[PDB]
């Protein structure tokens, strides 16, 4: 019987920080969320004092293939900035042009 | 500071300025109304207190 026992004796959740001297496109987008109440006459929001967050990201939505008709934007309609899409909407510009005028005569 | 902007940049800057003026007018109008209701509310409490 041989035994070696005797012989053994002897971060994932952190968002990107916006860069200082941030692009003008980002600032114009952040202003739109801050003043989103005035974009549409028919849409109203809860009162919120929204301050620019210390960390944030700009993202693009991705729809499921089943939402090809219901909730998809055409490629031409898509724009790099939230502002640029808003200008494209013809109904929005008509309301802004009309509403912008009335403030001017009153002023 | 003096700067030189292209056509597309000018359109974006004009669009923002239009929005802020509309937002400023809408915000003030809501303020004045709720301020008035405070005045009407106060004039009624004076009856309640008296």
């Amino acid at each position: 019987l041989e035994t070696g026992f005797d012989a053994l004796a002897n971060d994932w959740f952190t968002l990107p920080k916006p860069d200082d001297n941030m692009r003008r496109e980002v600032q114009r987008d952040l202003l739109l969320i801050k003043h989103r109440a005035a974009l549409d006459p028919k849409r109203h929001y809860k009162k919120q004092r929204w301050e620019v967050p210390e960390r944030f990201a700009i993202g693009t939505i991705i729809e499921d293939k089943s939402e090809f008709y219901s909730s998809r934007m055409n490629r031409k309609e898509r724009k790099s900035t939230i502002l640029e899409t808003l200008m494209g909407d013809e109904a929005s510009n008509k309301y802004f042009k009309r509403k912008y005028n009335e403030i001017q005569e009153k002023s | 500071r003096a700067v030189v902007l292209g056509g597309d940049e000018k359109k974006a800057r004009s669009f923002i300025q239009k929005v802020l003026t509309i937002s400023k007018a809408k915000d003030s109008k809501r303020k004045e109304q709720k301020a008035s209701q405070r005045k009407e509310r106060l004039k009624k409490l004076a009856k309640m207190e008296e």
Binding site: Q27 | R1, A2, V3, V4, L5, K10, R13, I16, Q17
Partner: peptide, 11 residues
């Protein structure tokens, strides 16, 4: 910052 900047040499 748009208020800070002013546009010149326009066409």
């Amino acid at each position: 910052e748009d208020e800070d900047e002013e546009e010149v040499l326009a066409m």
